[PDB]
Design a binder for this molecule. Structure first.
Ligand SMILES: [Zn+2]
Ligand SMILES: [Zn+2]
Ligand SMILES: [Zn+2]
Lengths: 109, 172, 57, 588, 105, 207, 59, 201, 83
RNA sequence: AUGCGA
């Protein structure tokens, strides 16, 4: 797995280097880590998406009805984490400024 | 810019029975200020300045006992250039239910309007520069158009350079 | 029938006239400019079906 | 949105699950039986698709709440389908389970103890105890009932121990365990499970030879004959068409007898609700009725065309009424009529009618499942490029927005945007009035909607709106002396009035140019109203971040309506925070 | 703010005991009774209501069809996009459902 | 490290010519009360010892993880990548003569400044780095023997295809391997089809 | 009083009520009315005073 | 199984208490003190008076008003306590913390309070001072706070009219002042809350 | 879920996103008649007012930093290094 | 949906 990961980051680095583009290694390295998150070569199409946990994110990409069917048949519960899924329900996005909560200190006397 | 409109009263009628709408008035109760735009026959005075909301025609349907009008809906004012009364292709249709009204919308050159040379080097007018602020030649003139030179080095529109020097020679 | 077909350009017949498409055969003369008006009658199309092709050959 | 109207009941998750006909009948606002749509040439047919119980219409109040078309949220009716049919969405599923059963015993043709082993694996995978799920395979020892029960005892003992440990260790909880790897191991297990379920080409628990099951594709299943070697083998062990009803009666009993495994087969997480797994989930004994609100006709400029849902649903109601007419034939015939084969044609009505209604339900679900530009069903409505999700959920139209051709200007700041006074007078911010902004908003109101920093509208704390579109300088002057009035109702004492002020030189606005290709192409600029402009004015320094050029390029201008979106558009998205790209960190 | 607050932001009824946002309805008022929020799914038919084995006082509400109900008074309002309500339209036909949880009743 | 910060994080000489200005920006006396300035620096000393001790890749003395593994880099000034630490120390050593031309700055106060720049250049908690990544790979791919450009990027990212169109395997040849030996091996591995050796085939069908 | 800004989202008891004696009721009434007197609710407080008067003996 | 749902009806529709007659000679102790937990909003303008905020906002409109949940007309509140949003702060802090919504400046908080509620039930024997006397009812006022009326049909025919004239009791003297009755019903679906009384049981 | 104050382990610095949300929410409060604890000094923009309140750390807000586990750290403005 | 502007 680590050799395939380093091969991905090298191959993509070669593709951009061919066009004399600068791209931070942090981006390619993140993408590679995400493709290997399961220890394999998990592409980014619908097939790889199947294994993700957010059913709304699956619904909102492709084969909407197929992901819906597999979700209902599971009796699945959405934990409403996917930013897309969270948008579907009209919820503060969990990224960035929604990564946290704000409370207030108030005088009791 | 000319925009043509068809005001039809059968666009989707239903023969003899349906007909009842006639351009004009009946109840008197209408705002008489509509005559400020529509002649006493229900059609606007050719030449009239119209702004969105002004009546473009007025008619009367016996079923509703009301003086109705077709409103003009646009972002800008126009003027009525031609009003043409169509009884044509009809068997009788004497009630004059189809009218074609042409609106004239003047278009002054303005910032954002696109202009192009015969060289496909198109650009919007960024501003209408005051004549005093333009550059004036020792001939006593200030140009009509100023085009940035840095546009030519990518496009290589040198035909435009030659057209400038040929139109200058040919005018002189 | 020829006003409809000539008003939509969806030519359909029991042989298909041996043509690769059943629409697009008709165009508005769009007289907004004399250049455009004369240009319409000197325009020729390779046809919509090749417009659908992904290649460029 | 209004900041003056908080809510504190946010949705925390979304559960999915199948309805039930008893649930629909109980919630249902009405049963729709009449395939009629309109009556008296111009009225909503009683108990038809346009009954007022399904919401408000034509100034007729919703017959279920009495609310106007502008107030009634609408209510969902239901159709009592003649037969049971098949749920298309689960038709692939129920077909598999039909192929998985035994027809002489009504058990799965896979070894019962092996099934219980599968239940064990799926139970350990509800809590995501994968290492233990694989460790279960090791438990090993003609096979006695005492021995197969010993395997069920030892396996249940392993489930009880591995669970007791994991709950003791907090390595899971009563609520289950859910992660990407657990989902993957479940899909893999359920796949091999379905392969074992399909592998048995004769039963095992009962040894009987089940028929081969064939299907038409989306409306019929047939039951294949068997071989005299297998039939006589069944006696020593002692293609046909079938209705959806027969499938339902079989699958109910099969799904009940195999409830113990299916409890975890049909849940990826613990079924806390102790919900029985019923076969009626794949079949439709009833059909709902959407709110009238969402069934309004297609009016395009002038032309009013009936809704395609009304058409397909009316086709279900008509076909259903024909089958009801065959049931009229049962009341008709069936006294005895001993030799009247006359019903041989009515039997053609049963086969044709039944496949027809089933096909028509399919078509109402998915056009590509029926049998020339067929009105789209809900499956077509939800997917493809649109996917209601994509065209109205993942992206939407928005208010407080403008689009215009951009014009250069070097005299504005590099962080500002020149707004033409048409937009400066047509874009508002809902400003709550205080002691510190009373002067500015009183003046803005005095100016009115037809000036500079005036204000188009005033929203009271009571909730009502007062438009200044047509008020005279006198009336706006009168309202300017009322912006600061005292409390009036304990219901409203905590609020303060709002003024919809025009966009002005102190607001931040979010400019976007199509290409969005990157976050740096949609930045926040500080508004600078430019007189006698008609185009959105932009500084040259930004054009290499939008990849924009005055050739004719158009830009969208978004005006945020909230101090949170203001503060973010001035602090996070702002142009200065975008001086470098994250791609490379080279200045753009 | 963009994809919600300035588009289709709606405060919609949801039943805190059944987790759906489409069974909610306004109960009918009377000369002495105001409009009250009721959930159709959380309401017993006045023709049954264990009437054979069996009132609180304030649990009967009436439908525009003059139908008496017991219960249904446990629904509240929550902010969602209206298209969400559009989802029950298609999905509820699909024989599935949203259990929109909240708070903790 | 945030890319939108890194650009000068490795331009030490520039920071030095503008030392007093950056000392005025990131003045540490405001912050030296909120964090630890030693724990990470001490780990840096012991680890720098073990790192100079093991300065072969897979028969090294694995025992000390990097300082970034053992201390939150935002909290103990000095928790920095070994690559950045190495470059900084090597700069301070290779410019000791520039450190013999200054008004008076020193590699400990300058090194302290560069560590504090590193702490203040870190990616913020909550950064949308996924999206940023996706746009940083997409957006520049619009400007676009083996598959290149968009089809190659699609062949990886989009499909993860187990069947490359032009699968290649690179083979390094030993320093001792002659070029002529290399051409012999090139012949020795390449496939040779029977067709490739046939000159003419004559079939005389007689019946 | 019709929305969150005026009416509580949810109300739940944590124990079964306790049958406050006449003396506890009167002490609560006097403490509540006295503490509040020191706004149309005042009129209901006037009714609470009548309850106080009725729990005191004479209207 | 079919008894889970009946357990749902009986156990969900159960009633807490049956307020008894004080000394069996007074009125039912329908006045009870019950500690509850409410979830209220706090505006920003009360951010410097938060217990008073909760009071003026939600609890002040509740007094002298029927709450379906408490089963009566709120007679008053005791012991307001805001539930702190943050542990490790003992219980007696100088400031509390509360969650602010992720959309508005408004806060939402948990509160614990004891309510004094008048929780009458059917069968309770009550006494009232005659408000009115019409030929279909006798109006009375419980404690000078609760309106009560006994309609003619629920009064024994053995009662006697004297002409809005006057009613005379079954013993042979006209009624006056206070009346003892059993509670038949309480009507709180209207603007106020009317208690339906009976003189026949 | 309560991360003890003695145990808070997160960045002593306020993130740009934290600062953004604080300034927005607090500004919105001042604009809804939250009591201002600093001299208005002429200002009329509630956002610039909240910026002044941040400059004096008078803001009475607390940041709840979430951890993906669900544990959180309650941090005052008056401690998180503003910039 | 066709053409088309960027
Ligand atoms: Zn309704
Ligand atoms: Zn069997
Ligand atoms: Zn419900």
């Amino acid at each position: 797995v680590e050799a395939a990961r380093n091969t991905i980051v090298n191959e993509i680095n070669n593709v951009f280097s061919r066009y004399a583009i600068s791209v931070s290694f942090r981006h390619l390295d993140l993408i590679a880590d995400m493709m290997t998150r399961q220890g394999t070569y998990l592409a980014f199409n619908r097939q790889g998406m199947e294994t993700s946990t957010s059913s709304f994110m699956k619904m909102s990409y492709e084969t909407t009805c197929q992901f819906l069917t597999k979700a209902v048949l599971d009796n699945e519960r959405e934990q409403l984490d996917s930013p897309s899924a969270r948008i579907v329900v009209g919820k503060l996005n969990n990224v960035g400024t929604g990564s946290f909560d704000v409370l207030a200190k108030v005088p009791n006397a | 810019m000319y925009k043509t409109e068809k005001v039809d009263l059968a666009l989707n009628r239903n023969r003899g029975d349906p007909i009842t709408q006639h351009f004009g008035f009946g109840n008197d109760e209408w705002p008489k200020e509509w005559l400020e735009k529509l002649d006493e026959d229900g059609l606007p005075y050719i030449g009239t300045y119209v702004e969105e909301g002004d009546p473009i025609c007025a008619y009367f349907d016996d079923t509703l006992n009301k003086t109705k009008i077709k409103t003009y809906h646009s972002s800008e004012p126009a003027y009525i250039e031609e009003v043409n009364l169509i009884g044509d292709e009809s068997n009788k249709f004497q009630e004059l239910q189809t009218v074609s009204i042409k609106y004239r919308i003047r278009r002054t050159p303005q910032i954002g309007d696109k202009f192009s040379s015969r060289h496909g080097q198109k650009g919007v007018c960024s501003r209408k520069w005051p004549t005093i602020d333009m550059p004036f030649s020792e001939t006593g003139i200030q140009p009509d158009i100023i085009i940035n030179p840095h546009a030519f080095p990518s496009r290589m529109t040198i035909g435009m350079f030659v057209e400038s020097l040929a139109g200058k020679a040919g005018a002189l | 029938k020829m006003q409809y077909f000539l008003s939509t350009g969806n030519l359909v017949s029991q042989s298909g006239l041996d043509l690769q498409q059943v629409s697009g055969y008709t165009v508005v003369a769009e007289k907004i400019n004399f250049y455009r008006f004369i240009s319409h009658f000197r325009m020729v199309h390779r046809g919509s079906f090749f417009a659908q092709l992904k290649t460029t050959t | 949105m209004d900041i003056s109207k908080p809510v504190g009941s946010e949705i925390t998750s979304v559960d999915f699950g199948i309805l039930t006909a008893k649930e629909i009948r109980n919630l249902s606002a009405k049963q729709i039986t009449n395939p009629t749509v309109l009556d008296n040439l111009g009225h909503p047919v009683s108990g038809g698709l346009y009954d007022l119980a399904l919401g408000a219409f034509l100034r007729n109040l919703c017959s279920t709440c009495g609310l106007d078309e502008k107030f009634c949220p609408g209510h969902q009716g239901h159709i009592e389908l003649p037969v049971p049919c098949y749920n298309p969405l689960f038709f692939n599923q129920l077909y598999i389970y039909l192929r998985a059963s035994c027809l002489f015993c009504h058990h799965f043709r896979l070894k019962s103890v092996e099934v219980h082993r599968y239940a064990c694996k799926l139970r350990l995978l509800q809590y995501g105890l994968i290492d233990e799920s694989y460790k279960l395979d090791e438990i090993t020892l003609d096979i006695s009932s005492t021995l197969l029960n010993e395997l069920k005892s030892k396996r249940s003992e392993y489930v009880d121990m591995a669970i007791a440990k994991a709950l003791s260790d907090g390595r899971t909880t009563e609520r289950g365990s859910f992660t990407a790897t657990v989902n993957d191991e479940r899909k893999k297990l359920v796949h091999e499970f379905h392969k074992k379920l399909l592998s048995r080409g004769k039963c095992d628990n009962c040894g009987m030879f089940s028929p081969k099951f064939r299907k038409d594709g989306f409306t019929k299943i047939f039951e294949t004959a068997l071989n005299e070697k297998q039939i006589t083998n069944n006696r020593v062990k002692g293609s046909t068409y079938i209705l959806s009803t027969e499938v339902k009666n079989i699958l109910d009993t099969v799904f009940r007898k195999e409830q113990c495994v299916l409890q975890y087969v049909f849940h990826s997480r613990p079924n806390l609700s102790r919900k029985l797994v019923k076969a009626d989930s794949f079949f439709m004994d009833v059909l709902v009725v959407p709110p009238t609100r969402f069934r309004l006709p297609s009016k395009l400029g002038e032309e009013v065309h009936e809704n395609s849902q009304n058409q397909l649903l009316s086709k279900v109601l008509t076909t259903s009424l024909l089958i009801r007419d065959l049931n009229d034939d049962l009341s008709k015939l069936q006294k005895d009529k001993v030799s009247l084969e006359d019903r041989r044609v009515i039997f053609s009505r049963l086969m044709n009618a039944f496949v027809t209604i089933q096909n028509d339900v399919n078509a109402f679900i998915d056009s590509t499942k029926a049998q020339k530009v067929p009105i789209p069903g809900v499956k077509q409505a939800l997917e493809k490029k649109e996917g209601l999700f994509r065209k109205h959920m993942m992206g939407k139209r928005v208010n407080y927005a403008a689009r215009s051709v951009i014009s250069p200007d070097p005299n504005i700041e590099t962080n500002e945007i020149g707004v033409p006074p048409v937009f400066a007078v047509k874009l508002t911010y809902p400003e709550p009035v205080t002691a510190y902004n009373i002067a500015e908003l009183r003046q803005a109101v005095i100016n009115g909607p037809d000036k500079w920093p005036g204000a188009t509208q005033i929203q009271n704390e009571d909730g009502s709106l007062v438009s200044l579109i047509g008020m005279s300088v006198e009336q706006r002057k009168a309202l300017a002396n009322q912006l600061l009035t005292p409390s009036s109702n304990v219901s409203t004492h905590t609020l303060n009035k709002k003024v919809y002020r025009h966009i002005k030189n102190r607001d931040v606005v979010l400019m976007n140019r199509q290409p969005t290709l990157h976050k740096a192409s949609m930045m926040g600029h500080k508004v600078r109203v430019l007189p006698n402009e008609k185009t959105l004015r932009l500084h040259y320094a930004n054009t290499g971040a939008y990849n924009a050029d005055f050739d004719g390029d158009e830009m969208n201008m978004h005006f945020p309506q909230n101090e949170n979106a203001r503060a973010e558009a001035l602090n996070l998205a702002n142009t200065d925070s975008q001086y470098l790209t994250p791609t490379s960190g080279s200045p753009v | 703010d963009r994809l919600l607050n300035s588009s289709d932001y709606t405060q919609a009824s949801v039943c805190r005991e059944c987790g759906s946002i489409l069974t909610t309805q306004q109960s009918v008022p009377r000369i002495g009774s105001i409009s009250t929020v009721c959930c159709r799914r959380c309401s017993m038919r006045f023709e049954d209501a264990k009437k054979l084995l069996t009132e609180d006082g304030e649990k009967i509400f009436i439908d525009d069809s003059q139908i008496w109900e017991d219960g249904q008074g446990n629904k509240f309002v929550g902010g969602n996009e209206t298209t969400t309500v559009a989802i029950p339209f298609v999905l509820k036909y699909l024989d599935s459902e949203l259990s929109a949880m909240g708070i903790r009743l | 490290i945030d890319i939108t910060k890194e650009s000068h994080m490795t331009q030490f000489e520039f920071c030095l010519d503008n030392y007093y200005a950056l000392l005025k920006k990131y003045n540490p006396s405001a912050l030296i009360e909120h964090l630890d300035v030693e724990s990470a620096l001490k780990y840096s000393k012991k680890t720098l010892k073990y790192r100079k001790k093991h300065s072969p890749h897979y028969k090294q003395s694995v025992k000390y993880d990097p300082v970034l593994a053992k201390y939150n880099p935002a909290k103990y000034l000095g928790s920095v990548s070994e690559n950045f630490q190495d470059k900084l120390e090597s700069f301070l050593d290779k410019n000791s003569k520039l450190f013999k031309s200054s008004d008076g700055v020193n590699e400990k106060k300058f090194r302290a400044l560069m560590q504090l720049k590193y702490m203040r250049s870190l990616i913020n908690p909550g950064e949308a780095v996924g999206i940023i990544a996706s746009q940083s790979v997409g957006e520049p791919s619009t400007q676009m023997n083996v598959t290149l450009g968009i089809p190659r990027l699609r062949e990886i990212v989009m499909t993860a295809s187990a069947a490359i169109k032009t699968p290649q395997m690179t083979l390094p040849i030993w320093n001792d391997v002659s070029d002529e030996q290399a051409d012999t091996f090139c012949k020795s591995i390449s496939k040779v089809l029977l067709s490739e050796v046939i000159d003419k085939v004559i079939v005389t069908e007689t019946t | 009083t019709a929305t969150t800004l005026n009416t509580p989202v949810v109300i739940h008891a944590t124990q079964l009520p306790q049958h406050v004696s006449t003396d506890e009721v009167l002490q609560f009434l006097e403490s509540f009315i006295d503490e509040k007197e020191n706004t149309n609710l005042s009129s209901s407080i006037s009714q609470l005073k009548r309850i106080q008067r009725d729990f005191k003996g004479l209207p | 199984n079919e008894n889970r749902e009946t357990a749902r009806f009986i156990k969900k529709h159960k009633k807490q208490v049956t307020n008894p007659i004080d000394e069996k000679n007074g009125t039912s102790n329908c006045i009870v003190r019950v500690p509850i937990a409410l979830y209220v909003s706090l505006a920003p303008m009360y951010l410097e008076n938060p217990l008073q905020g909760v009071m003026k906002q939600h609890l002040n409109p509740l007094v002298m008003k029927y709450n379906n949940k408490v089963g009566g007309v709120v007679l008053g509140y005791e012991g307001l306590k805001i539930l702190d949003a943050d542990p490790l702060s003992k219980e007696d802090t100088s400031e509390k913390l509360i969650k602010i919504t992720p959309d508005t400046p408004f806060g939402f908080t948990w509160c614990h309070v004891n309510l004094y509620v008048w929780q009458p039930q059917v069968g309770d024997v009550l006494e009232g001072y005659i408000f009115i006397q019409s030929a279909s009812h006798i109006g009375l006022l419980i404690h000078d706070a609760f309106n009560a009326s006994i309609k003619k049909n629920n009064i024994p025919v053995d009662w006697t009219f004297v002409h809005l004239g006057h009613w005379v009791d079954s013993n042979g003297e006209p009624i006056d002042g206070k009346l003892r009755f059993t509670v038949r019903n309480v009507h709180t679906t209207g603007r106020v809350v009317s208690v339906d009384g009976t003189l026949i049981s | 879920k309560a991360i003890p104050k003695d145990q808070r382990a997160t960045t002593p610095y306020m993130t740009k996103y934290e600062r953004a949300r604080i300034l927005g929410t607090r500004a919105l409060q001042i604009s809804m008649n939250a009591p201002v604890f600093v001299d208005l000094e002429g200002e009329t923009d509630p956002l610039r007012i909240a910026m002044k309140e941040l400059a004096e750390k008078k803001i009475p807000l607390v940041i709840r930093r979430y951890l993906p586990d669900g544990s959180f750290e309650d941090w005052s403005v008056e401690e998180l290094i503003v910039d």
